[PDB]
Structure 1
């Protein structure tokens, strides 16, 4: 038996982030613009951001849609200032 295929359960979803400059509430998906090379998806957690594989990003957006269909876009210069977790 392997791990069960379920929607990733983000902890304490919806609350405010601890670190400054967070582009949105905890559990939102953020992506880099296409004009600066291959796009990298990421998830905003309480104390920073974590990288996401292209397939998992679609599941989180499809599941957490609630009417939304696209992620937040951030410039490479500002993204580099947020702490990695």
Structure 2
């Protein structure tokens, strides 16, 4: 999968460093053809961002990140789309906040009683990203793949 050294918003949560990526070693043409291609590592493109929600009681404009308080159990992040909310994995929520920051640094905290009224929707694909930091191998000790 392809990744770009200028996209600091994605490199940091994964556990990569811009210099480290730029100093990566070569790859042979022979191996380049053998490996199958997967989707690119980029910031998720949430549709129709910024507009008002269709459903009532929406905590904020479309594309904002919502979280629930820790006192009621393990925190579940979610995203508010036009017609409802879809769940987010922990590692992706961090990327959306970092990239969609525009100066904002934290999500809106909402209680279960008010959350339970929002309809559940599923409209964007997010299975490409891993669920935890990358254990990048230090190439000097493993020069063969």
Q: TM-score, normalised by structure 2?
A: 0.58
Deviations 1:14-41 (A, max 9, x none): 1110000000000000000000010000
Structure 1 runs, 4 residues or longer, greater than 4 Å off: none
Q: CA deviation at 1:42?
A: 0.2
Q: How many residues align?
A: 85
**Cα-to-partner distance string for 1:50-78 (whole Å, 9 max, x where unaligned):** 00000000000000001111100000011
> Going by fraction, where is helix more abundant, 1 or 2?
2
In angstroms, what is the RMSD of aligned CA positions? 0.4
Unaligned regions of 5+ residues in structure 2, if any?
Answer: 1-36, 122-145
Using the TM superposition, give the Cα deviation of residue 2 of structure 1 relative to its aligned residue in structure 2, in angstroms: 0.3
More strand by share: 1
Once the two structures are TM-superposed, the CA of residue 48 in structure 1 deviates from its matched residue by 0.2
Highest RCO, 1 vs 2 (Cα 8 Å, sep ≥ 6): 1
The structure with more radius of gyration: 2
Counterparts of 2:49 and 2:106, CA distance in 1: 18
In structure 1, C-alpha distance between the alignment counterparts of 2:47 and 2:114, rounded to whole Å: 25
The counterpart of 1:4, out of the listed 40, 45, 64, is: 40
**Alignment of 1:81 onto 2:124:** no
Q: Counterpart of 1:41?
A: 77
TM-score, scaled relative to structure 1: 0.99
Question: How far, CA to CA, are the matches of 1:11 and 1:25 in structure 2?
Answer: 12
